[PDB]
Design an enzyme around this catalytic site. Sequence first.
Site, PDB file in Angstrom:
ATOM      1  N   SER A   1      81.563  59.403  27.718  1.00 54.75           N
ATOM      2  CA  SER A   1      80.981  60.657  27.228  1.00 54.75           C
ATOM      3  C   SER A   1      80.646  61.583  28.394  1.00 54.75           C
ATOM      4  O   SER A   1      81.554  62.010  29.121  1.00 54.75           O
ATOM      5  CB  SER A   1      79.746  60.377  26.368  1.00 54.75           C
TER       6      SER A   1
ATOM      7  N   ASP B   1      86.102  58.414  26.012  1.00 50.88           N
ATOM      8  CA  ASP B   1      85.629  59.485  25.127  1.00 50.88           C
ATOM      9  C   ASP B   1      84.858  60.560  25.891  1.00 50.88           C
ATOM     10  O   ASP B   1      83.708  60.883  25.576  1.00 50.88           O
ATOM     11  CB  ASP B   1      84.765  58.932  24.001  1.00 50.88           C
TER      12      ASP B   1
ATOM     13  N   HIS C   1      82.297  57.800  18.294  1.00 55.68           N
ATOM     14  CA  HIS C   1      81.771  57.942  19.648  1.00 55.68           C
ATOM     15  C   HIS C   1      81.074  56.671  20.123  1.00 55.68           C
ATOM     16  O   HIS C   1      81.310  56.209  21.245  1.00 55.68           O
ATOM     17  CB  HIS C   1      80.805  59.123  19.716  1.00 55.68           C
TER      18      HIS C   1
END
Length: 368
Positions: free
Chosen positions: A216, A239, A294
Site C-alpha cells: 500500500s 497493492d 486490499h
Amino acid sequence: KIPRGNGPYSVGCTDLMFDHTNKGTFLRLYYPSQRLDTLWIPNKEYFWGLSKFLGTHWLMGNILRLLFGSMTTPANWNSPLRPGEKYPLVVFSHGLGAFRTLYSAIGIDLASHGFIVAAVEHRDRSASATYYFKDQSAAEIGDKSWLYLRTLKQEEETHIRNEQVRQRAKECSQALSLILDIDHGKPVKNALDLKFDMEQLKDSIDREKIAVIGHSFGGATVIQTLSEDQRFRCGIALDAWMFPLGDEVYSRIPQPLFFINSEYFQYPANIIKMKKCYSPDKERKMITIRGSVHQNFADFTFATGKIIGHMLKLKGDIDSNVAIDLSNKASLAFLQKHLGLHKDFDQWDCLIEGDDENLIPGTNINTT
Ligand SMILES: CC(=O)Nc1ccc(S(=O)(=O)Nc2ccc(Oc3ccc4ccccc4c3)cc2)cc1
C-alpha cells in the site's frame, strides 16, 4: 491463526531500535533460527492508534485490545540466528495505519525460505502508533513516548503524502545502512533490552542480495526507495498506493520492479501510475490475485472468522491462505530471478506471469 512459514527453515523474531530517538531506526527482524511465542501486537497503544485510524473512540481501542492483545504469531521470539550461511535481505515497509508487526505472514514465510526480513516501523506519522525515547534515561526504565497517526486536511494531502514517502524511503535506507553496518561488526546498543545479541548478525548478510518490499503506502515506498538507493537490487510492491509519488520518480527506477495487486483495491488513476513506471529497457512484472481485497496482504485477514472478515472487508472471495501463498510464491520466484538466488523458487515462475486459476496477468483495468 497466522500461517506458519512454508519453507524448510525455522524462524526467529526480535526487535531492534537504534538509536533511541525518533530519527533512529525501529524494525522487527524475522530470520532463520536454530516455541512459537512472539506477541503479535505487543503494546496497548497500538490498539488505541488502530482505533483512531479506524474512526472510533476510546471504547473500540480497549475492545481490540481484549480480542487480540495476547494473540501470537508463529515465530520463535529471540531464538538464535541459524549460523553458517549468508542470507539475502528484504527491507519491508508497512501501509498507512499499520506498523512493523502487521505483516508477519509475509515476513515469516520469507524467513522460512532463508531470508532475513527487516520490517521497519515508520516515524513519518503514517503508522497508527510508534514510539521512541526522549533520552537514554527514559530508555533505561522503558518510558516510551508515543506518536500517533496524523490525519490530514484535503488541502494538505498531496504535499504531505509525498514528504512522508520521501521520509519513508529515507527510513528504509537507514535500516539497510544499520543492518549493513552490523554485518561488518559495528557495535549497537538496542534501546530495547532484549535477549538477542545483534553481534550474531556479523558476516551474516549477502550484501549484494538486497530487496525492498512494501504494501500500500509501503508499495509507494518501494518505488521511492528504489529510485533513491541503488544498493537495493529489486522491488516488490504489494497493492501499491501510488498517490504519494511525485511525477519525476516514475522514469527513475532502474531496478526490477514487481507489482502484485488485489482485484478490489485497484482503480484506473492508480493503474496509470504503475504503467508510467514501465520502460522497454526495464524489467517490470504485474499480476492481480482474483477475488482479493486490499487487506489480503496484512495479517488481519487471518484474525477473524470467514463471515465477519468478509463483512469488515478483511477477507475477499479467495481464501486468505490461498491469496498469501500465491503472493509469497510469486515474490520468491521474482526475488530469485533478480537477486540471483541458488534456490528452487523458479518452480513458481508461472506465477510471475499470472498462469494460475486465481491470477490475472497484468490487471483487468484498461488505461490509455
Ligand atoms: C480509508 C482508508 O484509509 N483505508 C485503508 C488504508 C490503508 C490500509 S493498510 O492495509 O495499508 N494498513 C493497515 C491498517 C490497519 C490494519 O489493521 C486493521 C485494518 C482494518 C480493520 C478493519 C476492521 C477491524 C480491524 C481492522 C484492523 C491493517 C493494515 C487499510 C485501509
